[PDB]
Every structure is written in C-alpha cells, then in structure tokens.
C-alpha cells in the first residue's frame, strides 16, 4: 500500500518542472521519479501517460500509436494532474525530459541540461529568419496606427503601496526564467540550434551597459 | 546495508533544466545607518569566508638600497616638487576615498576620530 | 553643506585648504541604498501600470493576450509599451512613431524562436510582428511565488516593539515590459543604423554594447534588465561543447 | 636652514622608499599593478615590502623580517573596511594582511592638484602616489604596532577609536615615531 | 538575564535583539564601562569550556582570516 | 531523550575512546533561533 | 601598439577597444601630467597629417 | 643649439634601441627575420623586446618585464587588422601579442 496523496504531489511537481510549465526550481531527487512513475502506474486514468513515459526506457522504442480520442483523453488527464495551454508539444517536452532523465546514470550532483530532441529540418537561426520573415510579409496586417503618461502622485502612491510587499528580486527571477524557457522551447520546437552564447551575451550586454 | 545504499541512491539528485540565476549587482546597504564597529564586525565575518593566499618572500632581510647616485638622482628629480602640495594631495585623496567608502557603506563618519588620526604632529612637536 | 580640510606641514605655518561639498557624498549614499533602487524599479513598473490603466487596459495581460478575436487591444498594449520605453530612453517625446502597423502571429510556422516582437519595413511603413502564442505561453507559465531569493534583526526588534494586483499580475507586467524592452533595443538599432545592422543584431546581440553605449549610456536612464546580473546555471559545462583555443584582441564585451 | 634640513629628511626618506620599490623588481608602476586584479602576487609583494620598509624605519635595529604573509585582496564592497585600505595583524604567529584593491585604485587614480641624456624623469603624480601608498601602509603599520604592543583588544579598539595613536604612543618612543612620514604633516577636518 | 537587560536599557531594543542571537557583543558593550567601574562577574570566577569542543565544532569550520578578532 | 540517547549509543561502533555528542533527534518544523525569537515574542506579548 | 596597450591598462579593455577605432583617445586620455613620460616616445617627435588634394 | 640637443636625444634613443637589438642575439637583420615565416620565435622575441624597451622608456622606474607572451603570427589577410600590424593586450594576466608579418614585410 502506498500514499496516493504524497505520490501525486511529487508527480505533480516533477511533471510541472519537466513540462516547462513552471519556473519553481526545487532540487529533484531519484525518489521523486520513483514516486511519479509509481503513481502514474497505479492511477487507472493515467495508464496512457505511464505507458508513454515507460516506453522512453529504450531509445529505439518510440511513442505508442494513439487515436485522436486517446490523445484528447491524455491531454485532459495531464490538465487535471496539473490543474491549470497544454497541448501536444507539452507532451513531447515531457517525453523528451523523462527519456533523458531515465537514460541518465545515477550520480551525486544534479545534471544541468537544455531542452532537445523534440518536434526533420535541422535549421539555424538565419534560415529561419529569412523563411519566417517572408511568411510574415505574406500575412496581412490587422491594425493600422496613425499618449497619456499620467503622473498622478496619489495614484502612483497607491500602486507602490500595492506593489511594495512584492520581493522585486523574485519578480525579476520569474520574468527572466519565463523568457528563457519560452525562448528555449521555441528553439527546440522549431528544430533550431539554441546558441546560449548569444543569450548569455544579452545579459553581458546589460551588465556592460549599466557601468557606463 | 542494502537499505543504506538505497537511501543514498534515492537522495541522489536528478537532471534539471537550466535556470537564470540572479546575482546582486552592487552590495546595496539597508536603510538603517550602521556604526564603524558593527560594520567592522560584519565585514570581518565576510572576510573570514574568503580564501587566503600564501606569500613567500625570497629572503628575510628588509629590502633597501644604498646606491648613492640613484638616491641623489631621485632627490634631484623630486627636488622642485613642494612637500606642501604633495602631502596635501595625499591627505586629501585619502580623506576623499575614506568618505566615499563611508557614504557607500551607509556608515556614520566620525569626524573627531579622523581628526585624532593625525594628532601625532603635535605629539611629536610638544614632546 | 560644505566640509573644509586643512593640511599643515612641519616646515612653516602654511596651510593649504580644500572645500568638499557634501551633496556628492549624499548622492552616492542614496544610490547605495537598496530601498532606493527598489523604489526606482517599482516606480517605473507603477508608472507602466498607470499608463495601461488610463488606456482602459485594466484587464490582466494574460487575459488580453488570450483573446484571439480582439486584435486592437493587443496592438494598443504593445504600442503603449513601446512608447513608454521610448519615453524612458528619451524623456522629451511623448508620442511614439506617428504611424506603424501591427500583425499578430498565431502559428509556429511563421514564428521567430526567441524574438516574439519583431520589426520590418514594407517599403512604405513600419510593421511590427507580435507572436501571440509565445507571449501567452510566457504569461501563463506558473511562477515561483513562495521561494525566497537571497533583515531578521529589525523584524525581531519590531516584534519585541484599490485595484487588486496580485504578485502574478505584477510579474506578468514586468515580463511584458522586459520583452518589449528587448524588442525596443532591436528597434533602436534598426531605426538608427539601418536594416542591415538590425538583421546583423538579430543573430548577434553582442553589437548592443557598441551601438548603445555610444549614445544611451550617457544620456538616458538605466535599463530594466540591468537591475540584476543574470547568469545561466552551469553555463560553462553546457558551453563546453563550443570551446575555442582563443586569442581575443577585440574583447569588446567582457 | 632648519626647514631645508627637514625637507631633505622627508624627501630622502621618500627617495629611499622609491629605490626600495625599484629593487623589488616591478613590472609596472604602482597604479598599474593595483588595477591588475589578475596578478595578486605583485600587489602583495609591494604592500609587504612597504610594511617591511616602515618596520625598519620605525625600528632601526631590525634588519630582517618574516618571509611569509597570508593575504587577501579585497574586491567587493561587502568585504572592505572603510578608512582602512590595508590592515595588518597576525594569528598563531603568522602575519595576516588585507588589501582593499578598488579603494587604493581610487586613491591613486584621483586627479591631483598641480598649482642629462638618459631620459629618466619622475612625474609629480607618480611621486604623490608613492607618498600616498607609503602613508596608507604606514597607518596600517601604526595599527599593527598597537596590536603587538598592547594586545589584539587594543588593536580592535584602536580600529574604532584612533585616540590610541596619541595615548598609547608614549613620548619615550617619540624619536622612533618621528621616523614615520605620517608624523610630518597634520590633516584636520572643520565643518563649514 | 541582567547582562542582556543592561545592553537593552543602555543601547536600545535593536542592540538587545542583536545580542540575543550573538552574545559576542557583550565584550564590547560591557568592557567600555563595566570593566573599570564595577566588581567582578560571578561567571568569571572559573574558566568554563565545553568538553571536546573542537570535535563537535568541526562541523562548522572556516578557512578564516580574522582581522577584527575582538573576542579571543 | 532516553530513546534518542540509547539509539545513538547502540548504533555507535565499539571504540576505544568515549564519544562526546550533543542532544539531537527529539520532538517537523526545523527552525533557527531568530524565527523562534519572533514567534515566541509575539506569543508572549499575547499573554497577559 | 604600446600606446594602445597602455590605454588598455590605464582605462580598461573597453577604452582599448574604443581607441582601436577612435584614435582621439591618444590626445584625450593622455593627460598633461604624464606629458614628460609620453615625450620619451619617439612617436611624439614628429607629426604626420593627411590633406586632400 | 637646442635643435642639435633634440636631434642628439632622438638619435641616441635610436642607437640604444639598435644596441638592444644587437644584444638580443639576432641571426639575421630585421627584414630578413620578418620574411622567415619558418622561425616565429625570433620574430616574437624581436617584437616582445621592442615592447619591453618602449615600456622601460615610458616608465623609467620599471627595470624588468613579464617573461611570457602568447603570440600569433598573422599570415593571411582574413586575420589581419589594417593599420595595426602589432597589437598588445592581456587576458587573465597573460600578455597577448598579434603580429601581421606580411604587413611588416611590406613596410620594411
């Protein structure tokens, strides 16, 4: 007999991280993987997800064939587990993450990786720039534009009072990690090499900008 | 023993995606002013965590130079240089750096202590 | 207030005197206070929220970006954010570029991986691209709102002695503001140095330091992303795949 | 001609410090070393030998000095002591040195008021920087000597209350302390 | 308790709550006035030490550099 | 206290010199001194 | 090359990089206090100007 | 006679540089070294010691110099800086030198 609630909570947290649906950085151990897999097996309506993630043990065995109703049901199951949008690419992210976690060896220090192996056309940033630029130029513009900056002291005072208890550092961390994860997921989904040199050089540019 | 091995294994961290880590840009001090003593205690605690480096001199003898020609030559080169202006510049840059550090550190500057620093003048003159 | 210093040497009665103006030291001390910089950033964010409010944009940003049908609100929000950032850079122009067009993207097939807001010239007018699903995914992501990022003594001493804006909403506002700030830096290089330099910058952000510090570093305020030093966890290990036996003689970006 | 004799005193002392720094086998001028955070060995050597030179001046019978020194080169504000760029002490008989590099860089990089064939010449800025570093290490040595002569507690109390420079400096060793260039000038602060 | 209370009354609530978490401030806030005016303290009659203090403290060891060792 | 002490004594290996320990593993909320200071200070201020 | 190197040491790799493209730092960042020092260079013994014709 | 004194200044400086190059133990004249792409050690030594000589002239109190130098001898155009045949900098405290050999050969 196992505790359904604890296993469900561990599964929820680990899947939240492994789906890139949350920026909560909590050190995850092998125990959380064991709990999430056991809960996935035990719960009847998560059997599809459990089989999906268990197929990742061998790299040569790929995703089971699911008819549209099965994919929709699994999407509803994932949504219920996360109580949050969620779609097929989230499932692909989860599959890749769990595959890399499972095939990884037992080790003393957490391994830091980047999203990869999701979604034939292995491209770079510039070819995508050209192609999507042409495609965007194809698209018809929707709105044509042809400005109040009020400094109402009382209103800004009330806004500051509302914002004052918020730990600015936490807000910056959340925003930066959200932008980073969205950029990485867009790169991986588009099958484009994510050049972290450029992304880190963005921060380096900000740092060099400040001190002048 | 197998249970202990499994306990060590289950606490092993798993792979995680990278995250953007925030580092403090400038050691910004808090609103409440601090005195020199509390600042000294805090900064000494911070220094304790640093890793000291070993310096090994070639020999124990005090460095020195008895080359006359070089000594009178340096003296001649610095001869047209007034001592008043040199000492004034040195003292004022020392004072400015001290005051800047005090202001940045949000620490109260005791004028009397800084004045007492340079009372060895009268101590020498009187005795 | 001014402070006077006197130096006296033992060879004469001469005294050389200098006057220091305390306002400089007070300014440094104020700039060294954490609460001061926190107030500056929070006041910028509050001004942004007030600017949105006076434009009826009171609905949460996630709800604004989740509405596929109503494009006018998305275009107005992005334009207002761009104008706010432009005014922050140049506190003399209240109206942004007087004419520009907006196109909203709902497909991955025509999406740019990492630059959700992009600018282009259709030979007649500025055009701005908005990747709506990317911004929706950004704002809808769950935030870490219980963890603490590193004074207990003052709290101990104290113990011994109306628009509803949640933390999630404020984080969403800051996220959109930073995204539009990045877009505006790209747009500034565009407008001031040509399409060629803009598309060069899109693939190499390192040109920002040279094309901003020449004018912006001495004339405008501080940038929002410069409030904290951001680094990627275990950056060296992940970058080990691309290592050069280098010889950097033009290391213009430390 | 007594004032000329005293100026000769001070300038000869400064020239001897200059020549010691020359003999110490320097690759760059002082300021240049202090902006080079990559090479802490040279900064430590300069500070240590200035301390040794001051020690010999204060104690003319002492001809050698310890050959080891634990040192930390301060880089960040949260580990820097305002008003004390260099601090000397020892624990279990091992000399302990702390150098605030950014503070000394700011000290030597200020703009100072400026009211034969071999091409040798010394600028005013260089000489004044030399005197400034000597004075700073000399203040550090005063704190160090208070430590040795009256305990780590008198050292710590003097770090916060500098009147021990005039109380604990007895008149018997007035001739000894007069050897310090810090005693050749007075600097006072008056509100205005 | 009276040493804590003396720091309280003479240096404020902030210093009192600072002392509650760090007793090492007693040496600085007592020796300035008490060490030369009052009698000897009762706990100073004997030198008290914890048995095998170094071994138990080995969990918290610093590669230290103490320049303000105000408490030997 | 007795249970913790005897557990640590039993699980300790046979050794030539007496092992000096401190009390631990007695009585979820792993706290420090300052949080306790604040909490118990508020609770004491509650008490009449 | 040594002038560029000395600009590097005295004012940062950024001043070095900016001087690599803008050589007016040879006359701005070379303060008159070290004029005697820079006069020791043989590069200071001559002037070379370029005039359109 | 002030112009004669200044010419004596300049020519004595040039002669001292000449004598330093002589003491540096050269097998060939400068141009000859610079056309010898097979021996980069000699070119690096010449450039490094000229840098050291200039450093001593600019800083008369400096008598020694670093004993290590990372150097690259440029051969192709796509790795050459126009107008800057030799460039000095350092990274992690290690002197970094770049020499454009064809440019200097054309100069001499």
Residue numbers in the entry:
A (entry chain C): 113 to 196, 200 to 234, 238 to 264, 269 to 334
B (entry chain D): 208 to 334
C (entry chain A): 7 to 156, 161 to 171, 198 to 290
D (entry chain B): 38 to 152, 195 to 271
E (entry chain A): 219 to 290
F (entry chain C): 208 to 234, 238 to 258
G (entry chain B): 219 to 271
H (entry chain B): 38 to 145
How does the study describe this entry?
The most well-studied baculovirus is Autographa californica multiple nucleopolyhedrovirus (AcMNPV). Baculoviruses have their large circular dsDNA genome packaged into an enveloped rod-shaped nucleocapsid. The BV nucleocapsid structure consists of three parts, a central helical sheath containing the viral genome, an apical cap and a basal structure attached to both extremities of the helical sheath. Herein, we report high-resolution cryo-electron microscopy (cryo-EM) structures of the BV nucleocapsid combined with de novo modeling and Alphafold predictions.
The inner part of the basal structure has a C7 symmetry and functions as a plug closing the void created by the peripheric C14 anchor complex. The C7 ring, like the anchor-2 complex, is also composed of the two proteins Ac101 and Ac144. However, a major difference in the C7 plug involves one of the Ac144 (Ac144_1) monomers, where a kink is introduced between residues S38 and L39 in the long α-helix (residues 28–60). This kink results in a large re-orientation of the lower Ac101/Ac144 module (Ac101_2/Ac144_2) leading to the formation of a closed plug structure instead of an open ring as in the anchor-2 C14 ring. While the inter-subunit interactions involving the dimeric domains of Ac101 (residues 122 to 219) and residues 160-170 of Ac144_1 remain similar to the anchor-2 configuration, the globular cores of the lower Ac101/Ac144 module now face each other directly. This organization is stabilized by the C-terminus of the upper Ac144_1 (residues 270-290). In contrast to the basal or apical anchor-2 complexes, where this region of Ac144 is disordered, it is ordered in the C7 plug allowing it to interact with the lower Ac101/ac144 module of neighboring units. These observations at the C7 plug for Ac101/Ac144 proteins further expand the conformational space this modular assembly can adopt.
